[PDB]
Design a protein around this ligand. Structure first.
Ligand code: HEM
Length: 182
């Protein structure tokens, strides 16, 4: 089942409000044709260069950052082009990204919320329609809708009363979340 970690700061927030707000603040890095700039809005893989157990990206304007964890692959120019696919187990949100391939991984100096045991697996053949691609490219674009839809499905699978409209505290009471010190 999905497992959610949250700073006590967010105990009374709904997941949806937290995500809508975090993503709006992270803001669109404009990773689109004509605007991709290596080292500015590409993010990076560990160990990389285009595959690894983590993909991480910091905002081009705020300190906000996220880390996707699992077994991830980016096709670059190979068919189907510009596709992130593979197994996505976790998404961590916060600010102040640190690390990288030369450190052995990425971390957030301030990790606010993480969603683990996501169990998302997208085959390469689905290309940019795959869930993994939609979730992460949505985040890169300042749009947590795809992530929200996957979290909602995972929460309903535990119990239909649970959803992104539950508070983190409600989800902790339901057995799927736990707090970390603020
Ligand atoms: C090491 C990380 C990455 C590098 C170096 C990279 C590089 C590129 C390059 C060179 C382009 C062509 C457009 C341009 O140059 O302006 C591009 C486009 C694109 N990339 Fe990335 N990318 C990375 C990560 C990702 C990730 C993780 C995703 C999805 C989750 C993604 C999704 C896309 C999409 C959707 C396009 C536009 C495709 C289109 O509409 O033609 N990229 N990327």
């Amino acid at each position: 089942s999905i497992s959610i970690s949250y700073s006590t700061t967010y105990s009374g927030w709904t997941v949806a409000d937290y995500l809508a707000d975090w993503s709006a603040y992270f803001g669109d890095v404009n990773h689109r044709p004509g605007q991709v700039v290596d080292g500015s809005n590409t993010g990076g893989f560990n160990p990389g260069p285009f595959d690894g157990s983590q993909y991480a990206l910091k905002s081009t304007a705020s300190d906000a950052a996220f880390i996707a964890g699992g077994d991830l692959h980016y096709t670059l120019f190979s068919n189907p082009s510009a596709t992130l696919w593979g197994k996505l187990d976790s998404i961590a949100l916060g600010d102040t990204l640190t690390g990288g391939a030369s450190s052995g991984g990425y971390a957030l100096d301030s990790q606010e919320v993480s969603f683990s045991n996501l169990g998302l697996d997208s085959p390469i053949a689905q290309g940019r329609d795959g869930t993994v691609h939609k979730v992460v490219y949505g985040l890169m674009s300042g749009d947590s809708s795809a992530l929200q839809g996957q979290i909602d499905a995972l929460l309903k699978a535990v119990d239909p009363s649970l959803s992104i409209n539950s508070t983190f505290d409600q989800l902790a009471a339901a057995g799927v979340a736990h707090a970390t010190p603020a």
